[PDB]
Amino acid sequence: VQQVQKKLAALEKQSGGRLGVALINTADNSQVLYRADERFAMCSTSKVMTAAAVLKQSETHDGILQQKMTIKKADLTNWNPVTEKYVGNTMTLAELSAATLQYSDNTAMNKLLAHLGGPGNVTAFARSIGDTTFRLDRKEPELNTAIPGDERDTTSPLAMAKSLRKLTLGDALAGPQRAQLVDWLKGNTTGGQSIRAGLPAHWVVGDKTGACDYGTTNDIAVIWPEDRAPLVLVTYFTQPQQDAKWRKDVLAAAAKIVTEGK
């Protein structure tokens, strides 16, 4: 453990940024923490809490995931990998949730936010599940500024690890909703060079990445090591320069360091 600690600290010092790690081993509830209580900009990883809020509604509102929303050229933002393929057409909340989680579509994120009534409702949802750290303040793309010292749109590695666990393995969501979130996370197409890169290839993973200003490179995941109890891992990383380049490789190394031998 203290060896895992020295390695993480060395990884951070060599990277020149600020690293935040929180790993929860559901086998014995043990934890590997590094700046786990410090706040980091979540940017794209905040889409998990947001999608989960929509899923929560579906527990009481029958067929809500089949409800349609119109996509218009005016809704488009700086990143619409999927939504731009539907200009002038409709997308269901499920499709929007999938586009948001698996391709990190910014316009889909804003569609979900509009449906939920704004980011304050996502924050409220987080509080309803016991997360008092999480906070969503803005919409896309402003929530990605990741300004140092700014608390807007941030959370701690540990708090996000606990909520991801509650949402994917716990009781924060009901069975069908819990299963849909896990499926969406496993279908993510943007995490190939992050947490997944530092893990044995056959291990099963569900995750949500994030890449924003100040070279902030994030990733939150649920890991199933073969037939052993799943691990919940959060690797957050931010740098001194506003225009810094992303370090998906730092998250891969943090991942390997804390999960090796698990």
Ligand SMILES: *C(=O)[C@H]([C@@H](C)O)[C@H]1CC(SCCNC=N)=C(C(=O)O)N1
């Ligand atoms: C989330 O933090 C941002 C924001 C614009 O919504 C998006 C952008 C990306 S693509 C980053 C790196 N890909 C290729 N070079 C992601 C993402 O999931 O990676 N989130």
